[PDB]
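tool_call predict_complex ligand=fumaric acid
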Amino acid sequence: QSLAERVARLVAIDPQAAAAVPDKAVAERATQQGLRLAQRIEAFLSGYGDRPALAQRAFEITKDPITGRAVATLLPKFETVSYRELLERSHAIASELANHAEAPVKAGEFIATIGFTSTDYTSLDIAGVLLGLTSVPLQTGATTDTLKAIAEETAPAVFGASVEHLDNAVTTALATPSVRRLLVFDYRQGVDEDREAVEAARSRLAEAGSAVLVDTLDEVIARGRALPRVALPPATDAGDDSLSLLIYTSTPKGAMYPERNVAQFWGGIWHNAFDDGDSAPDVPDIMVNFMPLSHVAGRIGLMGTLSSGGTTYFIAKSDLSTFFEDYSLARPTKLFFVPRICEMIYQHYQSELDRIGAADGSPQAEAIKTELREKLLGGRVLTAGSGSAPMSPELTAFIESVLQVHLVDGYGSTEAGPVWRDRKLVKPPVTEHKLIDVPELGYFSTDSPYPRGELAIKTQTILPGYYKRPETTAEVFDEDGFYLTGDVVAEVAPEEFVYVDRRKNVLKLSQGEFVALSKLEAAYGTSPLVRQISVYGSSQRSYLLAVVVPTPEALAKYGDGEAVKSALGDSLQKIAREEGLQSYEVPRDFIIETDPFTIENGILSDAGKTLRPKVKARYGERLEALYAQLA
Ligand SMILES: Nc1ncnc2c1ncn2[C@@H]1O[C@H](COP(=O)(O)O)[C@@H](O)[C@H]1O
Ligand SMILES: O=C(O)/C=C/C(=O)O
Ligand SMILES: [Ca+2]
Ligand SMILES: [Ca+2]
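tool_result ok
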């Protein structure tokens, strides 16, 4: 039935969901026009009192019976941190940083951080706002070349890193003279691998003659608890226009986020990106977050639950190896997926089908969908949203058949904020739009059946610029002040839009046909044999190739050579037949990769998107050699 009825039924039978309903009085107080961002956050966190705010998987420390090594092992439960405790921890960090005897920090300085998403990272983010720092969250998969370049541009006074990334942090700090302090977070007292990582970091710094101080965030909080709270708001140079955050995207360019635009994450217009946050019903917001804080989508969900009195459960591991465990324990009411997560779930379903030898829409097949919905994903899902990348209709249909709720598609960017939701512009923040012909790619407003062109918009959430890069900023605005999305869209009904592709992903083959490479990647990603695919073309050639990571099942059946190429070929031609793709849209030959694209190896971005230039760097020589061999 309707969302209103399903919400009412859930809160009538589920005490945890009932208690997570927003309190309108808290939001009204926190969002008043007179309050600065730091005061807004404080009003939300203090307003929700002792409610659970954040949850992380519990762990135990065991001694290995052979070596005596003290090892952490996850336990089958989450432990929560209340709104009160989160605010107290963030104030403790702010107090310690501001009053440090040798390397205090002051408003307007920069802090750069490398981590995933966690209670500690959230506390450090908030503390940065309380102090008036500018935060620079760095990609965990970036090379040290990239880290050093961003650190040179931003000259941070403080560097923060999770234990996992501490070696890269040390390398960056050593080459960045502005760094005075290195804070280590997600540090687990008593765990040998964490203690050894911090000792090694201290030793490397000492060997280099560095004056950088190393402290765990555990220690920073313990010292800060006994210190007076810093006064809010911080004494920055520009009020609501002070620089609060830089979101590096793409040297990568840093999108500037003033306080007023960070405030939109905290009960502002971002609650309309993937849902109807404006009008009833008010859905209790219990959510699992698997997105790094370095990506805007990580911020949307996390600050969304914090600003609505709900709860964010953090996935236990960045590589997603605990995904189903965590969703089954957390049992969220609201889902946010991106396509690579939807593909993973589809692959899980296909992998069950094959293990038990059941077919398409059999009773057994439907029982796997039911178990996914009710057990693995928790059975409490009321709403679901997706975004950050295109998804094929077939994958959308699968996900909706599993969840038995509509999957909202939200389109937006770091630069513009949320732009549309289920084809319709999000207004506010969007105030004006137009389509721009792209003749060199064959996209015109006179196209049939639908006008097509690059989307340009005026919007309240537009970035003021890229940090220290006014020439790059000028390139993304036209002469009338519209922001150029770089994205080709079709207007399929009045003020309703569908994504075609990024301009950068559109390729003109040698016989003059145009291909939207990410549309093809989304289509072929649904092959039961494909784990990942990157479609590759050349202006000098008349046909496409692809890098394909087969599923473990495909590799076990066909190997990694000619046999699996032939099976993949059949599967892709099948998809081309069903979805009406042209013959020139079908990859003719393949580079087979048994090593998945990952965030760790840098081929996926923090958001899980396949980075075309990283694929090109790793496989481009082999792809071009295959073109030459075949010619
Ligand atoms: N719902 C969506 N459908 C298709 N592509 C999307 C969607 N949302 C975001 N994108 C893509 O992601 C880009 C923004 O990425 P980011 O700046 O990481 O949010 C856009 O310019 C599009 O290429
Ligand atoms: O869905 C949004 O509004 C943002 C998307 C992105 O930057 O990927
Ligand atoms: Ca700790
Ligand atoms: Ca311009």
